[PDB]
Amino acid sequence: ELVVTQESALTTSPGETVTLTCRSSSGAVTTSNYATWVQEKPDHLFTGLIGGTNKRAPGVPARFSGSLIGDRAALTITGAQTEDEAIYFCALWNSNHLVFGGGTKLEIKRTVAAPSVFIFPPSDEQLKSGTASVVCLLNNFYPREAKVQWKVDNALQSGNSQESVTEQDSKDSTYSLSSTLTLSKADYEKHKVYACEVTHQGLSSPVTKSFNRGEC
Amino acid sequence: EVKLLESGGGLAQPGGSLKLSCAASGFDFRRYWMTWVRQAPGKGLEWIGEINPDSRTINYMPSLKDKFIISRDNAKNSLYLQLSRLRSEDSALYYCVRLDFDVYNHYYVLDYWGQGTSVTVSSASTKGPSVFPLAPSSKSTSGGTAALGCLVKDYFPEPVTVSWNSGALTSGVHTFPAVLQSSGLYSLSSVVTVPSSSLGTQTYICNVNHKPSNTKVDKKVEPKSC
Numbered sequence A: 001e002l003v004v005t006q007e008s009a010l011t012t013s014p015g016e017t018v019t020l021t022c023r024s025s026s027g028a029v030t031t032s033n034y035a036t037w038v039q040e041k042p043d044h045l046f047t048g049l050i051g052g053t054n055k056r057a058p059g060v061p062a063r064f065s066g067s068l069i070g071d072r073a074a075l076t077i078t079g080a081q082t083e084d085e086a087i088y089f090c091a092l093w094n095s096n097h098l099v100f101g102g103g104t105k106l107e108i109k110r111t112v113a114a115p116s117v118f119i120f121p122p123s124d125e126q127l128k129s130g131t132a133s134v135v136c137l138l139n140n141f142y143p144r145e146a147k148v149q150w151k152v153d154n155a156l157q158s159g160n161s162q163e164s165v166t167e168q169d170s171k172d173s174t175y176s177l178s179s180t181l182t183l184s185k186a187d188y189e190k191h192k193v194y195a196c197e198v199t200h201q202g203l204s205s206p207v208t209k210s211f212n213r214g215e216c
Numbered sequence B: 001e002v003k004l005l006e007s008g009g010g011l012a013q014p015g016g017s018l019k020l021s022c023a024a025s026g027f028d029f030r031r032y033w034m035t036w037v038r039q040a041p042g043k044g045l046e047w048i049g050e051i052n053p054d055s056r057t058i059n060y061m062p063s064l065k066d067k068f069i070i071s072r073d074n075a076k077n078s079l080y081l082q083l084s085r086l087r088s089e090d091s092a093l094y095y096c097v098r099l100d101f102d103v104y105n106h107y108y109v110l111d112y113w114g115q116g117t118s119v120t121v122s123s124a125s126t127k128g129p130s131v132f133p134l135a136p137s138s139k140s141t142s143g144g145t146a147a148l149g150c151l152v153k154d155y156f157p158e159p160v161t162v163s164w165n166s167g168a169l170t171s172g173v174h175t176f177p178a179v180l181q182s183s184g185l186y187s188l189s190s191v192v193t194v195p196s197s198s199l200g201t202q203t204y205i206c207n208v209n210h211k212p213s214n215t216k217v218d219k220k221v222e223p224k225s226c
């Protein structure tokens, strides 16, 4: 069972040089594995970068290069640019079939940006369904590490919220996140203060956005 | 100007079969090896197989050697993938890919990729999403920017597409990846920032589309009155 492994995530600064590796579980990666690389940009846009271990595909800037380092295949990026933020997949030929690695997420460091926080009360239309969804939005921040705590009448919630995060933005390299607190119309009506408390490196102190049920 | 457009995805029943297809243009199809690749939720890419120009050589991923069949029609610049004995593990995005095959230099690259067609294996029935407004909690007076959006929830299976003002508004838009709720139904949000001063003058409509259920919804988002 050939298993190809890549580091899950790497961070580099603009202008710096970074190397991504690809290793085989069956032994050293060799020329007969014809290591190849694919780049994945947001919206499932894939592009082939390297073939035959060290050959650049047409249209690929010379800042990308491949080679064998130690027992692994590698992809080196020189003078990293924000346009290089993406997920890189490696793949090795195994005699009669191809095997992809798990992919590496390459993040390019940029200055810290605190998020703009917004809280959205459930609509009346939804309440008629017997469910209540409270949405909290954390817009354009960096780095990705962010903590969102829901409080209902000052009671910390748990197990009743789910969050989603967009891919790093192509332009400003920021992330956006949404946290959704789901309650039954019953429980929702039993409380008054709904708050979203956010903690992020770009905030000296946590930020809280809230609303009182019914108020408008 | 290489183009690869997949079709045939959708909801399928476990144990059933499905046929995906791919239309190619922008290059001499007849002279290229073609490939299928898929990506299941929370997983990486998985090679399915390939087929050479004259169809005399066809290689498959060991596992699916016999539950999948790849074929092509050079006269119609088309590639086909027949899936059978479907199981949940087969739920994924299926990609049509071109392989630049250079035996001289031992150069092999999956150069161009289609954007994929989604396939879901399940015994559940399709369900259209309910679209709720995420009203601007700001007044056209506050000045500056305001955030508003749409909550698309309780639909199945993936995917749904979201656009604002029939595609006119694209700047400042953030459509989050859907999350699978405990109920087994998907849910997602789409938001966008607009000038506060335009609230009341400009109409903001999110266009939601869910093909699996032939559902199309256009919800207008306005500031809730007090």
Ligand SMILES: Cc1cc2nc(N)n(CCCCC(=O)O)c2cc1C
Pocket: A033, A034, A035, A036, A091, A092, A093, A098, B050, B059, B099, B103, B108, B109, B110
């Ligand atoms: C992405 C990729 C796809 C491939 N398809 C085939 N058939 N080979 C093997 C090359 C031919 C074998 C030989 O002639 O020795 C592939 C190698 C790579 C890296």
